[PDB]
């Protein structure tokens, strides 16, 4: 299967990944206002599969801990969204066994939306208010199938975004975690046995987002 290693110790919150996702799938933009934050859109939605979250945390001495979280579907090895969807209509949520992608199909219109969202321990699934279909990061599965990196991965300048075979990426996550601990001692991988999107947080993941880890 495939995996993302996301090294948040390298993230400049450039939001190249946020725009790349929308360009590749030609998603529309949400109506946004500024309410006292660079963060926008403020939350994932039917038309936003990835948003960079910004949290400011105090530290001793000059500056702050600025925590950046490019949020997306974790593509769980055993996805709860599938089990909760299968209750209503098997086929609505599928697993591409070659890549590991957890993929919503057009049949999520038939299943219960709120149910499948509540079952997700990362609060990822988003429902179109009118059509009642569910959308989320699809791992850029067709790009991966055609031997290309996902849009958000290829676009990332810093080396935050990494993608490949789960063996090489777990090995990278391990090796990078040991190195990054030297400067950020509270550095941890997010649920590295359960998910195909393995975030390295520089501190307590909940500092980055309430649902950063299950």
């Amino acid at each position: 299967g495939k995996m993302f290693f996301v090294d948040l110790s390298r993230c400049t919150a450039c939001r190249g990944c946020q725009i790349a996702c929308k360009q590749w799938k030609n998603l529309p933009a949400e109506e946004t206002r500024n309410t006292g934050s660079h963060q926008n859109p403020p939350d994932l939605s039917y038309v936003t599969l990835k948003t960079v979250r910004f949290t400011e945390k105090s530290r001793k001495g000059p500056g702050i801990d600025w925590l950046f979280f490019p949020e997306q579907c974790r593509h769980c090895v055993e996805p709860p969204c599938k089990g909760q969807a299968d209750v209503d209509l098997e086929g609505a949520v599928v697993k591409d066994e070659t890549t590991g992608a957890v993929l919503f199909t057009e049949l999520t219109a038939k299943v219960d939306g709120e149910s499948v969202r509540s079952a997700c321990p990362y609060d990822i699934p988003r429902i179109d208010p009118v059509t009642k279909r569910l959308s989320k990061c699809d791992m850029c599965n067709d790009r991966v199938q055609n031997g290309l990196l996902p849009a958000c991965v290829k676009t990332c300048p810093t080396g935050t975004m990494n993608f490949g075979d789960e063996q090489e990426m777990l090995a990278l996550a391990e090796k990078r975690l040991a190195e990054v601990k030297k400067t950020y001692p509270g550095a941890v991988l997010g649920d590295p046995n359960d998910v195909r999107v393995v975030y390295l947080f520089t501190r307590d993941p909940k500092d980055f987002y309430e649902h950063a880890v299950a």
Partner: protein
């Protein structure tokens, strides 16, 4: 295959935003014949390796955009509506407005009776956004029409960089390049927010850290850059000289300077004349009356030949090095800590880390941009940093350099093409009224009696000749010389610059303005004055991608179109992906890009707009005559054209240059019509043309070197990321400038593990050597008269050593380093109703005035509205809650923004008083989007430093009140 791309033609391009110069892949439908379907990174490009920040990443949405211009619009005097109009009409009526105004205002000879052959009724702004070939041809079109008021982007920011670095090293350009950052041991980011404003640079900054580098951000604010550096040090606005002066004192006091490098390669050993002195913050030869210096009091002592005398012992008390030690003794940590606001502990940490790069096996680099260049102290900030780099032997080495980060994609190129009032292409000065002949013009070039000083500028006559033989190939250079306009020898040079152009326009001394790929109505400091000033124009030609605040100033906030009589032609140009051509990035990489989709609707490349527009002036002058016809009729535009339209390939070949007849140069035979293989083989006798001597080598007989996409590297090249076969850089593919300084007297690298060049088997191996000659035979700074890195610069107006004079006029009353408080060479009101220091800056998501990015829904999505960033302390003092609407006001205007309250802004301790800084983006404008807000330049002062000609956009007094 992927269905999205399946039947789309794949073409390469270069990003149309910042000067990193990231590679793109464009997919165009119907195998090239349709619209662009996809735009993303070029995985093979050696700078970005397929990565793009949100601006490059959204180029699809910029190109394929239904808000874009479709055809020329026209606005009639006192009208309130646009009128759709044909190209044939627009350029016929344009030509008539040019000729009328020209004839009426042409001065054959100035008041002193000297030949100038110029027009002072027409001005031109722009553009750093145009292709190099379009910039070159644009400049030549404006000068053939006799314009002298020719300015663009480059004046506002890096006008100080070029003089400061030219005085220091002999060239104004970024010394190293983006890939080279990864070789640095200590990266000092100061006056730069590079993670936001050159985002792909951080690929290479973070790779430096991977290999042991310390990353240091020195900034008044905590930014996205600060988040990913090892050291964040606050500094209060305009306290950079004290910071850098304290680092000079530290380096000298602690013998941390690289003695051999300093002895041989800097002017450390040169003896200053006895007439040089400094006391009470003033240099010798001060004229208190006029507020200016007698620079002859600073002149070196000269030996019998006229060569500056030297003590290689470095013992003579008038040695540059010993005067330097004396000058910077005053900059102790306690004083520097007190004025910067930076803790003594943090100053020591930073000084220790950076000064450690004095070791030959360590490289230190500085990354700065508009945080330095948009301050009145800019030129001395940069001088000081250049002096620190020379002391530490960091100039000419991999991981070293002064990385003056260029802004716009082709600001380097647009400067190189002479779209500034004071220069022709190739940094040959625009003649003044006293340069009555070519021979007199070439007399101004200073000579050196030193046999080891290459003094490459002595070749200027070959470049000026070849430049005149490109414009006028049938004429003798000496005759051709009279066709081009001249500035007044008497008048202050800055009178021809951006600042004064708006001053003059506001006196109604301009009939016409070319706003060519710029947004003055948002870009210019004091937007209220500038939008009113533009009314007093008769006509305005705006060339751009979209309708904007400039083209439509007449229907702007509190404007009555019926009262405003200005005539306005909006001509829509095509985006970067709809045309072929080259752009010169910050590292001087001249990169060739191709057309994907053909121009949208009836939009045209700028090349076609200006050429067609010129030809209509040219034909109209041939049927009607008028003022001094010669330069217009004779200008060689045949070389610019192929198949009835602008040819980037042919313009680029003319810019490189070719032999106008058989010639022997440097003992080699060259045929007629053949391409000049480098500027070394140009002549002053008319045998060669070259539009730009810097471009000689860029497009040879071997082919278009700017189009090379070849990652072939030797081990030594690959080890430091030279990529000498990817595109081409001026001069002659020297990737790291001053690289002779990276080796000793025998040609052995100071740092073999990161060798730039090495003397191997009677050859220089690695980078192209910056100056020909065997090891130890030449001084390494070949563009310098004397051949040395200048620690002591006797041509700088504010003195040969940078000295702290307070740029913040209002909240400061004490210079702790002298009796001289403010700049003794350069009237801010400091009205107590505006107690806070306003500052302007950018976000990753938006571009410049936002004309381009306020039309891209994904960037507006991310950053939809103007904001005002304030400390918790200011928020509390003024009763502002995060997300509250706030009124920001100054003497110049007022606007509303949303308040962003954050610990990323902190108050500054200035003389035991808390002073509050207020941050605003200048990306917004009344046109789009709805509820975006307007330009922060409603708030900024108009005037500024009269020496450099730059407004104070980085420190201006404001009030902020809840709504």
């Amino acid at each position: 295959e992927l269905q999205k791309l399946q039947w789309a033609k794949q073409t390469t391009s270069i990003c149309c935003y910042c000067a990193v110069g990231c590679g793109l892949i464009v997919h165009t439908a119907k195998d090239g014949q349709g619209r662009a379907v996809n735009v993303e990174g070029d995985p093979d490009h050696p700078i970005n390796e397929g990565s793009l920040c949100p601006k490059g990443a959204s180029i699809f949405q910029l190109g394929e955009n239904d808000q874009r211009g479709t055809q020329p619009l026209y606005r009639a005097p006192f009208s309130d509506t646009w009128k759709p109009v044909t190209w044939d009409f627009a350029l016929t009526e344009i030509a008539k407005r040019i000729k009328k105004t020209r004839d009426a205002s042409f001065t054959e000879k100035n008041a002193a009776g000297d030949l100038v052959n110029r027009t002072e009724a027409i001005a031109s702004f722009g553009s750093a956004a145009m292709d190099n070939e379009e910039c070159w041809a644009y400049g030549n079109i404006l000068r053939s029409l006799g314009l002298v008021y020719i300015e663009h982007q480059a004046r506002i920011x890096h006008s100080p960089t070029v003089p400061a670095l030219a005085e220091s090293f002999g060239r104004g350009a970024m010394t190293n390049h983006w890939n080279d950052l990864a070789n640095s041991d200590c990266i000092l980011i100061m006056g730069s927010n590079a993670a936001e404003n050159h985002p792909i640079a951080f690929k290479w900054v973070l790779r430096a850290k991977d290999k042991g580098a310390t990353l240091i951000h020195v900034d008044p604010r905590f930014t996205r850059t600060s988040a990913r550096c090892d050291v964040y040090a606050p500094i209060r606005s305009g306290a950079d000289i004290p910071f850098l002066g304290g680092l000079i004192k530290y380096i000298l006091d602690n013998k941390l300077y690289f003695t051999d490098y300093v002895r041989e390669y800097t002017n450390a050993s040169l003896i200053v004349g006895e007439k040089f002195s400094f006391k009470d913050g003033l240099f010798s030869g001060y004229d208190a009356a006029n507020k200016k210096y007698d620079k002859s009091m600073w002149a070196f002592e000269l030996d019998a030949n006229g060569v500056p005398k030297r003590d290689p012992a470095l013992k003579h008390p008038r040695c540059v090095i010993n005067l330097l030690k004396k000058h910077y003794e005053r900059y102790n940590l306690d004083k520097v800590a007190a004025i910067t606001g930076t803790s003594k502990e943090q100053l020591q940490q930073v000084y220790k880390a950076y000064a450690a790069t004095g070791k030959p096996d360590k490289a230190g680099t500085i990354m700065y941009a508009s945080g330095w260049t948009q301050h009145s102290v800019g030129v001395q900030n940069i001088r000081a940093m250049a002096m620190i780099q020379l002391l530490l032997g960091n100039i000419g080495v991999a991981g070293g350099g002064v990385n003056a980060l260029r802004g716009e994609s082709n600001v380097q190129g647009s400067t190189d093409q002479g779209l500034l009032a004071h220069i022709w292409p190739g940094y040959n000065p625009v003649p003044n009224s006293k340069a009555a002949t070519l021979e007199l013009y070439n007399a101004a070039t200073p000579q050196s009696k030193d046999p080891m000083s290459v003094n490459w500028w002595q070749n200027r006559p070959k470049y000026v000749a070849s430049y005149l033989k490109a414009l006028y190939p049938d004429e003798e250079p000496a005759a051709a010389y009279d066709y081009l306009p001249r500035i007044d020898a008497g008048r202050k040079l800055t009178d021809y610059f951006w600042l004064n152009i708006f001053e003059k326009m506001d006196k109604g001394e301009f009939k016409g303005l070319f706003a060519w790929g710029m947004n003055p109505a948002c870009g210019g400091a004091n937007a209220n004055k500038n939008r009113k000033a533009m009314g007093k124009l008769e006509w305005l030609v705006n060339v751009n991608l979209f309708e904007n605040e400039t083209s439509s100033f007449w229907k702007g906030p509190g404007m009555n179109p019926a009262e405003i009589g200005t005539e306005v032609f909006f001509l829509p140009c095509c985006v970067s992906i709809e045309k072929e051509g080259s752009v010169a990035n910050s590292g001087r990489w001249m990169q060739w890009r191709y057309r994907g989709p053909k121009p949208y609707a009836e939009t045209k490349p700028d090349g076609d707009i200006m050429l067609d527009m010129f030809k209509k002036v040219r034909e109209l002058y041939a049927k009607e005559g008028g003022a001094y016809p010669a330069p217009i009729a004779k200008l060689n535009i045949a070389d610019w054209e192929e198949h009835n339209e602008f040819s980037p390939t042919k313009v680029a070949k003319l810019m490189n240059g070719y032999f106008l007849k058989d010639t022997e140069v440097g003992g080699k035979q060259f045929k007629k019509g053949q391409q000049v293989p480098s500027f070394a083989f140009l002549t002053a006798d008319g045998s060669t043309c070259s539009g730009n001597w810097l471009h000689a080598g860029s497009f040879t007989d071997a082919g278009n070197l700017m189009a090379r996409r070849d990652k072939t590297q030797t081990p030594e090249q690959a080890r430091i990321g030279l990529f000498p076969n990817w595109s081409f850089c001026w001069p002659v593919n020297r990737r790291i400038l001053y690289n002779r300084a990276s080796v000793d007297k025998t040609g052995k690298p100071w740092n073999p593990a990161k060798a730039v060049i090495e003397w191997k088997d009677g050859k220089w191996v690695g980078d192209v050597v910056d100056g020909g000659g065997d090891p130890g035979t030449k001084h390494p700074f070949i563009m310098q008269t004397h051949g040395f890195g200048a620690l002591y610069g006797p041509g700088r107006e504010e003195g040969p050593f940078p000295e702290h004079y307070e740029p913040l006029e209002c909240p400061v009353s004490k210079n702790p380093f002298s009796k001289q408080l403010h700049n003794p060479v350069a009237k801010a009101v400091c009205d107590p109703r505006y107690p806070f220091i306003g500052t302007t800056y950018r976000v990753t998501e938006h571009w410049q005035t936002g004309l381009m990015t306020r039309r891209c829904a994904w960037l507006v999505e991310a950053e939809p509205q103007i904001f005002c960033e304030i400390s918790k302390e200011l928020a509390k003092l003024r009763g502002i809650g995060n997300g509250d609407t706030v009124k920001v006001s100054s003497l110049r205007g007022a606007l509303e923004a949303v308040a962003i309250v954050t610990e990323r802004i902190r108050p500054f301790k200035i003389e035991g008083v808390d002073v509050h800084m207020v941050g605003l983006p200048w990306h917004y404008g009344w046109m789009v989007p709805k509820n975006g807000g307007d330009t922060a330049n409603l708030l900024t002062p108009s005037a500024g430093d009269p020496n450099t000609g730059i407004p104070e956009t980085k420190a201006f007094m404001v009030d902020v009140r809840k709504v």
